[PDB]
Structure formats: C-alpha cells, structure tokens
C-alpha cells in the first residue's frame, strides 16, 4: 500500500532530475509579456524545444538502467518520446495557477500563435483533460519517465530490457495514486489513458509544424533529428 525504501529513493531521485527543467513561470512570462507575430512565436517554439530536448537527454540518461540499454534502442526511445514529453510538459505549464485573468490571456496567446485551428482544439482538449486530474509534480515526473521508457515503441530491438526498466516506475505511480487520490480509484488508469492521447500529437507533429502560419519553417540540426522535418 505505502512506498518501500527503494521506491522512496527512486521517486526522490526522479524528482531531483525533473526539477532541473526550465521554470514554468519563465516560459509563461515570455508568452504573456507581449503579443508576438506568428513568426516570432514559431522562433520561440524552436528555441524552447531545442532546450527541452537537451534537458530531456540529461533526465533520460539519469533514468535507472538506461545506460545499460543497447545504443540503437537508446536513440529509438529518445526519438519516440521527445514530442510527447514536450506536450506533457506543456499541459503541466498550462495548468499552473497564475494571477486572476492570466490563464485566459495565456490560452488566447497560444490560440493566436500561428498553429492551425484543426490542431488547436485537440491540443486544448488534452490540456483541459490533464488539468482535471489535479496531477502533482511527482505524477508529472513519473509519467514523463514512463513515456520515455515505453517498450511498445517502434524500432526497439530488445523490448524485455525496456519493460524491466518501466515496471518499477509504473509500480511507484500506481502507489502515489492510491495515496493522493483515494476518493478516485480509477486515477492510475485515467493517467495511463492520457498516454494514448499523447501518441496522437506525436503522429501529427510534422503536419502541426508545417501548417504553422509562417513564411519559412526554419529548424535547427538537433530539431531535424527529433522531429520528422527538413
């Protein structure tokens, strides 16, 4: 029912690692500062995502057992989770409490960023759905670790080796849900269900980027490796 010493150690270690991320307030201030053109917004997106992927590699390498995995499987896990991890992190940032009216302004600024309307609604539907779950920092950090260590990813040669790394994290998350949300026993299943919605954004990320209302879609060599873009 309660966490074991090994589990508390693992949880705290995932937490230290996750807290190395850029401050949510730092991100929201850049957006809420002034209304930018779609071109200035796309540039912010590419800068944010470049730093996100760099921080994600460092968090990923600290995941227990990750360094023991085959080098090609390591690349496949990272390439398959980078997009999902940024969307998951964007939902966390979105749902952080701000002074009255600022969350309405942040929503409107994102809606007017340059992204197509066809992608706006499923994006806000996912953020809204995440916010309803009232997730703690521990839950976001574990769910990010679980997303990275998904054996059910394409191009994985040794699925068993990855499943062995994902199981203890699934075990910790399941325990946290039974403790912080005892009135809702379906909470862990709800969280796991969100990961299927995450996968849809990954399937449409290239079209989302190319449909952005800018004259030129300029990327960095690192973003070309993580996104399916030229």
């Amino acid at each position: 029912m309660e966490l074991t010493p090994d589990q508390q150690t693992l949880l705290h270690f995932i937490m230290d690692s996750y807290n190395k991320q850029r401050m949510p307030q730092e991100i929201t201030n850049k957006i809420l500062k002034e209304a930018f053109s779609a071109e200035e917004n796309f540039l912010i997106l590419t800068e944010m995502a470049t730093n996100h992927v760099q921080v994600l590699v460092e968090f990923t390498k600290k995941l227990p057992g990750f360094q023991t995995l085959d080098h090609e499987d390591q690349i496949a896990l990272l390439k398959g989770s980078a997009v999902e991890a940024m969307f998951l992190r964007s939902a966390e940032i979105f749902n952080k409490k701000l002074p009255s009216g600022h969350s309405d302004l942040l929503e409107a600024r994102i809606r007017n960023s340059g992204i197509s309307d066809e992608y706006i609604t499923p994006m806000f539907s996912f953020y809204k759905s995440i916010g309803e779950l009232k997730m703690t920092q521990e839950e976001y950090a574990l769910l990010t670790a679980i997303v990275i260590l998904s054996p059910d990813r394409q191009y994985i040669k040794d699925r068993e080796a990855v499943e062995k790394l994902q199981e203890p994290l699934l075990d910790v998350l399941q325990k946290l849900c039974k403790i912080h949300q005892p009135e809702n026993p379906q909470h862990f299943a709800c969280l796991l269900g969100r990961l299927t919605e995450l996968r849809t954004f990954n399937h449409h990320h290239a079209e989302m980027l190319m449909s952005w209302r800018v004259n030129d879609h300029k990327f960095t060599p690192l973003l070309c490796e993580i996104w399916d873009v030229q």
Binding site: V57, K61, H71, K79, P221, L222, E225, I226
Partner: peptide, 12 residues
C-alpha cells in the same frame, strides 16, 4: 541519421 542524439547520449 542521428549524429547529434548519438553524441548527446554517449558523452559525460
């Protein structure tokens, strides 16, 4: 090819 990812994952 994933030269940069390969680099970020192998260095210390």
């Amino acid at each position: 090819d994933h030269q940069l990812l390969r680099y970020l994952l192998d260095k210390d």
